[PDB]
Amino acid sequence: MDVVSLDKPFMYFEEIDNELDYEPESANEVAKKLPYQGQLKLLLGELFFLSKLQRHGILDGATVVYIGSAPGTHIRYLRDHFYNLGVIIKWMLIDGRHHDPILNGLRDVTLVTRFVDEEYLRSIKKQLHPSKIILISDVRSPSTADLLSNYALQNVMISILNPVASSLKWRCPWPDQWIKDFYIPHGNKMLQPFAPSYSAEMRLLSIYTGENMRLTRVTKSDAVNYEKKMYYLNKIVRNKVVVNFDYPNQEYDYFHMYFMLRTVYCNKTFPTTKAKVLFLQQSIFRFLNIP
Numbered sequence: 001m002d003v004v005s006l007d008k009p010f011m012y013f014e015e016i017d018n019e020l021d022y023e024p025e026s027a028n029e030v031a032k033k034l035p036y037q038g039q040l041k042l043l044l045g046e047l048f049f050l051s052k053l054q055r056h057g058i059l060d061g062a063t064v065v066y067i068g069s070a071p072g073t074h075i076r077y078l079r080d081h082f083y084n085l086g087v088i089i090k091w092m093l094i095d096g097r098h099h100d101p102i103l104n105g106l107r108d109v110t111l112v113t114r115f116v117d118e119e120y121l122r123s124i125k126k127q128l129h130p131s132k133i134i135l136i137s138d139v140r141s142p143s144t145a146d147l148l149s150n151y152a153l154q155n156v157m158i159s160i161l162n163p164v165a166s167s168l169k170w171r172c173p174w175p176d177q178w179i180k181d182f183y184i185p186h187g188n189k190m191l192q193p194f195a196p197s198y199s200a201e202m203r204l205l206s207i208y209t210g211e212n213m214r215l216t217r218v219t220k221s222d223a224v225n226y227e228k229k230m231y232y233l234n235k236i237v238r239n240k241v242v243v244n245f246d247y248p249n250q251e252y253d254y255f256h257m258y259f260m261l262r263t264v265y266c267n268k269t270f271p272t273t274k275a276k277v278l279f280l281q282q283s284i285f286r287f288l289n290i291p
């Protein structure tokens with residue numbers, strides 16, 4: 001058994017203290033172990049991000065614009081969580097595909113079946129006005145050409161929607177498939193527990209202060225680094241059993257998840273953080289129908 005004692009997990013890409021030469025063979029390895037892992041990955045991360053906003057005093061009263069939301073089965077639990085805490089939020093979910101019916105009939109969530117373009121973003125910006133916006137984008141077209149095009153759109157989202165915070169889907173293209181150096185918004189590289197076994201994807205979380213917009217170039221040397229750190233994490237780290245982690249599940253991912261969950265806010269008071277986390281995990285697993 002691959003055991004170990006860890007103090008804390010790698011919460012952000014910058015914390016990963018080791019790299020590995022990427023082994024193409026890993027592509028053939030089982031990508032997921034849990035049912036609805038996708039909605040799990042999505043929800044913990046989106047819960048983490050939003051709790052922050054709440055912590056910063058910027059969530060309440062905001063309109064959450066989620067682009068690339070369908071099915072968005074998990075979004076429903078998210079919506080209830082803040083709604084039950086008493087935070088006022090309006091959700092505007094947009095996708096060309098259809099949303100999980102559990103999203104319907106809630107007055108505070110508006111579904112839209114529209115593939116957004118730069119033009120559309122301008123009208124939704126005029127119609128949202130003057131509400132403060134929090135943007136969440138998880139749009140997907142894949143080729144580096146596809147990727148760049150997506151990253152380009154996310155950038156036009158922020159420039160037109162002019163949000164107070166954002167969470168963007170972030171996966172660097174692969175160095176052996178580089179096309180050109182491009183810019184992404186400055187934000188924290190949030191590591192996603194329960195992401196596919198060899199996923200190099202994370203979530204870019206940014207808070208927009210002032211009227212400024214800080215970007216950052218991404219070059220192939222960067223793409224090489226992203227590849228090596230993400231492969232070491234996936235291969236080595238994530239397959240770690242945190243034997244000093246006293247929990248129903250000591251596997252890394254749950255250890256990593258405990259850490260994002262211990263930051264989430266609840267109504268019920270617990271004697272310990274073990275209790276709140278066991279509680280929110282159980283709650284979310286039950287919601288997702290995950291054993």
Ligand SMILES: Nc1ncnc2c1ncn2[C@@H]1O[C@H](CSCC[C@H](N)C(=O)O)[C@@H](O)[C@H]1O
Binds near residue numbers: 096097138139140
């Ligand atoms: N311009 C566009 N506008 C909106 N959604 C888009 C888009 N281009 C791709 N997408 C959508 O992005 C989605 C990628 S999957 C997104 C999953 C969703 N966040 C969840 O909770 O399950 C797809 O449904 C796709 O239709």
